[PDB]
Design an enzyme around this catalytic site. Structure first.
Site, PDB file in Angstrom:
ATOM      1  N   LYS A   1       8.523   0.702   5.595  1.00  0.00           N
ATOM      2  CA  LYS A   1       7.727   1.895   5.195  1.00  0.00           C
ATOM      3  C   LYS A   1       8.946   2.921   4.591  1.00  0.00           C
ATOM      4  CE  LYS A   1       5.531   4.751   7.884  1.00  0.00           C
ATOM      5  NZ  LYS A   1       4.633   5.249   8.932  1.00  0.00           N
TER       6      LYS A   1
ATOM      7  N   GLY B   1       0.786  -1.088   0.020  1.00  0.00           N
ATOM      8  CA  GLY B   1       0.160  -0.104  -0.072  1.00  0.00           C
ATOM      9  C   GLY B   1       0.862   1.242  -0.028  1.00  0.00           C
ATOM     10  N   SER B   2       0.160   2.520   0.023  1.00  0.00           N
ATOM     11  CA  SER B   2       0.966   3.569  -0.104  1.00  0.00           C
ATOM     12  C   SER B   2      -0.234   4.842  -0.037  1.00  0.00           C
ATOM     13  CB  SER B   2       1.472   3.958  -1.489  1.00  0.00           C
ATOM     14  OG  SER B   2       0.991   3.372  -2.614  1.00  0.00           O
TER      15      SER B   2
ATOM     16  N   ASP C   1      -0.717   3.415  14.475  1.00  0.00           N
ATOM     17  CA  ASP C   1      -1.019   4.461  13.602  1.00  0.00           C
ATOM     18  C   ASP C   1      -1.523   5.805  14.657  1.00  0.00           C
ATOM     19  OD1 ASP C   1      -0.587   3.180  11.382  1.00  0.00           O
ATOM     20  OD2 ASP C   1      -2.520   3.448  10.552  1.00  0.00           O
TER      21      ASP C   1
ATOM     22  N   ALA D   1      -0.338   9.206   1.250  1.00  0.00           N
ATOM     23  CA  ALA D   1       0.770  10.452   0.868  1.00  0.00           C
ATOM     24  C   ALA D   1       1.647  10.530   1.999  1.00  0.00           C
ATOM     25  CB  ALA D   1      -0.357  11.860   1.041  1.00  0.00           C
ATOM     26  N   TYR D   2       1.836   9.706   2.922  1.00  0.00           N
ATOM     27  CA  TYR D   2       2.872   9.602   3.983  1.00  0.00           C
ATOM     28  C   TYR D   2       4.086   8.883   3.411  1.00  0.00           C
ATOM     29  N   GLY D   3       3.899   7.768   2.770  1.00  0.00           N
ATOM     30  CA  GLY D   3       4.829   7.058   2.173  1.00  0.00           C
ATOM     31  C   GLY D   3       4.319   5.967   1.451  1.00  0.00           C
ATOM     32  N   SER D   4       5.310   4.836   0.949  1.00  0.00           N
ATOM     33  CA  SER D   4       4.875   3.604   0.603  1.00  0.00           C
ATOM     34  C   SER D   4       5.416   2.472   1.364  1.00  0.00           C
ATOM     35  CB  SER D   4       5.676   3.401  -0.859  1.00  0.00           C
ATOM     36  OG  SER D   4       5.386   4.526  -1.710  1.00  0.00           O
ATOM     37  N   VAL D   5       4.508   1.318   1.137  1.00  0.00           N
ATOM     38  CA  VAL D   5       4.883   0.166   2.278  1.00  0.00           C
ATOM     39  C   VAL D   5       5.058  -1.156   1.559  1.00  0.00           C
ATOM     40  CG1 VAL D   5       4.035  -1.051   4.245  1.00  0.00           C
ATOM     41  CG2 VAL D   5       3.534   1.280   4.034  1.00  0.00           C
TER      42      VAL D   5
END
Ligand SMILES: NNC(=O)c1ccc(-c2ccc(Cl)cc2)o1
Ligand SMILES: [Cl-]
Ligand SMILES: [Cl-]
Ligand SMILES: [Cl-]
Ligand SMILES: [Cl-]
Ligand SMILES: [Cl-]
Ligand SMILES: [Mg+2]
EC number: 2.7.11.24
Length: 348
Positions: A49, A27-28, A164, A30-34
Site C-alpha cells: 500500500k 484497488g485505491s 482495517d 482516498a487513503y492510498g493505492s494497493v
C-alpha cells in the site's frame, strides 16, 4: 539499504525494493493505492500500500503516525500484522512517501456469508477467532471501532484475521442511508450520544454472529432513525436503570418520544439456532454498554467449549497512546513517523 526500482502503474510512480516482484494494481481509496506482489525474501504473496498525501495536513500527518504505530504493535494469529514498511528516501530531508506491506488476503466474511451453507460448528469457530483477536486488541486498550464482515479475512481452512482498524477516517456522507458502513454500529455511537469505548466492538460481534446464523443483516436500517427503531424493537426501549445513566440531553429527549417496547424472545427470532448461541447473543446485544459481556468473559461461554484453551488466548504488550492528546506541527509528526520507519524489525 536495499536497491530500489521505479515503475508507473495506473498513473502512479511506485519505487520499491527489488525483493518485491510482479506488482499488479488491486484497488485505491482516498487513503492510498494497493498492488499485489510476490515477496522473494519470504515466499509470500503480499499487499503493498502506497499512502496518498501522508503529510498534507496536521490531521493527515497524525493519522499516518497513528496507522504505523498500530500496525507495528499488532502481533497475534487473528489480527493483521506488518510484514514490512519502507521509504525510498535516504534522509529525513527528502522523506515524502510511506509504503506498508501485509499478507495478501483473498476472501472476506461477506463472501462466505452470501455463498456457503454454514454449520453451527463453522459459526462457533469463526466467532471464537474474532473474540480471541478482540481479547488481544482490548488488552492493549485499543478500540477497533469498525468491525463488519468486509474487515474480516477468511481462508479455505475457515481461519480468520481482523483488519482495517478505525483510524477515525469515516465521514458523515459515508454513514448516511441504506449502507453496511452503519449496520454494525452500537445505537449510542450511531448519533454520538456517548464517546467510543471497547464495549462498542462486542455489539458489532453480536450483529456479525446473528448474520452468520440467519444469512441476513440483523439491523439493515434505511437511515440512523430507521436503524434505531429496528434495534429497540428487538432489545426493548431503555429501562429506568439505563435512563438514569444517559448524560446526553439530545438522547433522553428523542427516546421519551418513543412508545415503550419489551425485549423480544430471541428463540422466536433465531428459529432453530443452538440454544447456547441464542444465550450468547442475549449477552452481547444489551442496550446498556456497561452490562454487555466482554471478549475475555465470552471466550469462557459454553458455546465455545470445543475450541476454548485458556493457555492459548494471549494478551498484548502494553501500548502507549499518549501521542493522541499531543499537539505537534506537521514536520514533528513527520519526524516521529520517519523514526518508526527506520526502527522497524521484521517478524521471525
Ligand atoms: N453507560 N451508558 C451510557 O452512559 C449511555 C449514554 C447513552 C446511552 C444509550 C444507549 C442506547 C440508546 Cl437507545 C441511547 C443511549 O448509554
Ligand atoms: Cl531488495
Ligand atoms: Cl498477518
Ligand atoms: Cl520519499
Ligand atoms: Cl461489510
Ligand atoms: Cl508502546
Ligand atoms: Mg475495510
Amino acid at each position: 539499504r536495499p536497491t530500489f526500482y521505479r515503475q508507473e502503474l495506473n498513473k502512479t510512480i511506485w519505487e520499491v525494493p527489488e525483493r518485491y516482484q510482479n506488482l499488479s494494481p488491486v484497488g485505491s481509496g482516498a487513503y492510498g493505492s494497493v498492488c499485489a506482489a510476490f515477496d522473494t525474501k519470504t515466499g509470500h504473496r503480499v499487499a503493498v500500500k502506497k499512502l496518498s498525501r501522508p503529510f498534507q495536513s496536521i490531521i493527515h500527518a497524525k493519522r499516518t503516525y497513528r496507522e504505523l504505530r498500530l500496525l507495528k504493535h499488532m502481533k497475534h494469529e487473528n489480527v493483521i500484522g506488518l510484514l514490512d514498511v519502507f521509504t525510498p528516501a535516504r534522509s529525513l530531508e527528502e522523506f515524502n512517501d510511506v509504503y506498508l506491506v501485509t499478507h495478501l488476503m483473498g476472501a472476506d466474511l461477506n463472501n462466505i456469508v452470501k455463498c456457503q451453507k454454514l454449520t453451527d460448528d463453522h459459526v462457533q469457530f469463526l466467532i471464537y477467532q474474532i473474540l480471541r483477536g478482540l481479547k488481544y486488541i482490548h488488552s492493549a486498550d485499543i478500540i477497533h471501532r469498525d468491525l463488519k464482515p468486509s474487515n474480516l479475512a477468511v481462508n479455505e481452512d475457515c481461519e480468520l484475521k481482523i483488519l482495517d482498524f478505525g483510524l477515525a477516517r469515516h465521514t458523515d456522507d459515508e454513514m448516511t442511508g441504506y449502507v453496511a458502513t452503519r449496520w454494525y454500529r452500537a445505537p449510542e455511537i450511531m448519533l454520538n450520544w456517548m464517546h467510543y469505548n471497547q464495549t462498542v466492538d462486542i455489539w458489532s460481534v453480536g450483529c456479525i454472529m446473528a448474520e452468520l446464523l440467519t444469512g441476513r443483516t440483523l439491523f439493515p436500517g434505511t437511515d440512523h432513525i430507521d436503524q434505531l427503531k429496528l434495534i429497540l424493537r428487538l432489545v426493548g426501549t431503555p429501562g429506568a436503570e439505563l435512563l438514569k445513566k444517559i448524560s446526553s440531553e439530545s438522547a433522553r429527549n428523542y427516546i421519551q418520544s418513543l412508545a415503550q417496547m419489551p425485549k423480544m424472545n430471541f428463540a422466536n427470532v433465531f428459529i432453530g439456532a443452538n440454544p447456547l448461541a441464542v444465550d450468547l447473543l442475549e449477552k452481547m446485544l444489551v442496550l446498556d454498554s456497561d452490562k454487555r459481556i466482554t471478549a475475555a468473559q465470552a471466550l469462557a461461554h459454553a458455546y465455545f467449549a470445543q475450541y476454548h484453551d485458556p493457555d492459548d488466548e494471549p494478551v498484548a504488550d502494553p501500548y502507549d497512546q499518549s501521542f493522541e492528546s499531543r499537539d505537534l506541527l506537521i514536520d514533528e509528526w513527520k519526524s516521529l513517523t520517519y523514526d518508526e520507519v527506520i526502527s522497524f524489525v521484521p517478524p521471525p
